[PDB]
Design a protein around this ligand. Structure first.
Ligand code: CL
Ligand code: CL
Ligand code: CL
Length: 163
């Protein structure tokens, strides 16, 4: 475990992370995709061997000894708000199980279903609160990665609120 488990947020490419493992915002078919998924494919392409997994699940594949946890959030274009909310919570619970199983002291994590799977809605708070619900019982240092300046401020505020 980390000596004093923390949450932090950084605004940069998750492919440049300083953590012991990464969570990919994956598609169910293990395809290169767009956004975070494409960045992850360029940095760790070996981790896409047999990475396909259903919505609401996570599947870990090693790139050398570096673990890539492929977490499949729902595409809100296809799911109802209710069913998508259930699958988004479930994907993060599976990430917490994998982080624990791996024995890592730190993890880099993007906000699932906030980009091209958002169905055109702002899901920062929804996605971040499901992240916290899953990760709060883990003792890894969590570093959340985002690209938008206003999102960085809002994520930082939400972390600092609960300290
Ligand atoms: Cl960058
Ligand atoms: Cl997304
Ligand atoms: Cl962002």
């Amino acid at each position: 475990g980390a000596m004093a488990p923390s949450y932090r947020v950084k605004r940069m490419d998750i492919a440049k992370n300083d953590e012991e493992c990464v969570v990919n915002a994956a598609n169910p078919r293990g395809l290169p995709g767009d956004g975070v998924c494409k960045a992850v494919y360029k940095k760790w392409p070996e981790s896409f061997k047999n990475s396909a997994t259903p919505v609401g699940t996570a599947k870990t594949v090693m790139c050398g000894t570096y673990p890539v946890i492929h977490a499949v959030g729902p595409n809100f274009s296809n799911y109802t708000e209710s069913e998508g909310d259930r699958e988004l919570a479930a994907a993060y619970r599976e990430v917490a199980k994998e982080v624990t199983r791996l024995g890592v002291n730190s993890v880099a994590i993007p906000l699932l279903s906030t980009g091209v799977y958002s169905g055109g809605k702002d899901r920062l708070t929804q996605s971040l609160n499901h992240l916290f619900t899953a990760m709060d019982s883990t003792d890894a240092d969590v570093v959340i990665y985002c690209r938008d300046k206003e999102w960085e401020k809002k994520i930082s505020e939400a972390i600092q609120m609960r300290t």
